[PDB]
Amino acid sequence: GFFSPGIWMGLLTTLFMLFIFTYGLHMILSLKTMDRFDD
């Protein structure tokens, strides 16, 4: 088979890790820095 029980469980686990990781990395990459400062 193209998959096994263990592999399927592993892929589900890694996919639900990757969802979280992509969310986190998106937000962290949207971080920005200001170009100016006050007086």
Partner 1 sequence: TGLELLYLGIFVAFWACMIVVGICYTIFDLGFRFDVAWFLTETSPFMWSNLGIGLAISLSVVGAAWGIYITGSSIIGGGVKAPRIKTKNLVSIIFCEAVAIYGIIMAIVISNMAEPFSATDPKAIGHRNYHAGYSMFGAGLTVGLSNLFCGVCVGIVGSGAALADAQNPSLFVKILIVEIFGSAIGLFGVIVAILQTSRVKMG
Partner 2 sequence: SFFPELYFNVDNGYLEGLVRGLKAGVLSQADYLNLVQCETLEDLKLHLQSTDYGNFLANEASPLTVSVIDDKLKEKMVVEFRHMRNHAYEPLASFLDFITYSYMIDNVILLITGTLHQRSIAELVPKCHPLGSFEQMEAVNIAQTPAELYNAILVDTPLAAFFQDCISEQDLDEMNIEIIRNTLYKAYLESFYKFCTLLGGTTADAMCPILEFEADRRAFIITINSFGTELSKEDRAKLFPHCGRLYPEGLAQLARADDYEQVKNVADYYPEYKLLFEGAGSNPGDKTLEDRFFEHEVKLNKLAFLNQFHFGVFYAFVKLKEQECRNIVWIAECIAQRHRAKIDNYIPIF
Partner 3 sequence: NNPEYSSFFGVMGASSAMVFSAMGAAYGTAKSGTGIAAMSVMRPELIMKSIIPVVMAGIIAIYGLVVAVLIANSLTDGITLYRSFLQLGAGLSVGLSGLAAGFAIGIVGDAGVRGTAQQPRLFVGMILILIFAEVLGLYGLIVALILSTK
The token pair at 31 is 């971080």
Which one of partner 3, partner 2, partner 1, none is in contact with 17 (Cβ closer than 5 to 8 A by kind)? partner 3
The token pair at 37 is 């400062």
- Three-class SS of residue 37? coil
Q: Would you give the binding string for partner 3 spanning residues 1-39, x where CB under 8 A is met? A: -----x--xx--xx-xx--xx-xxx-xx--x-xx--xxx
Cα(26)–Cα(7) distance, integer angstroms: 27
Q: Would you give the binding string for partner 2 spanning residues 8-37, x where CB under 8 A is met? A: ----------------------x-x-xxxx
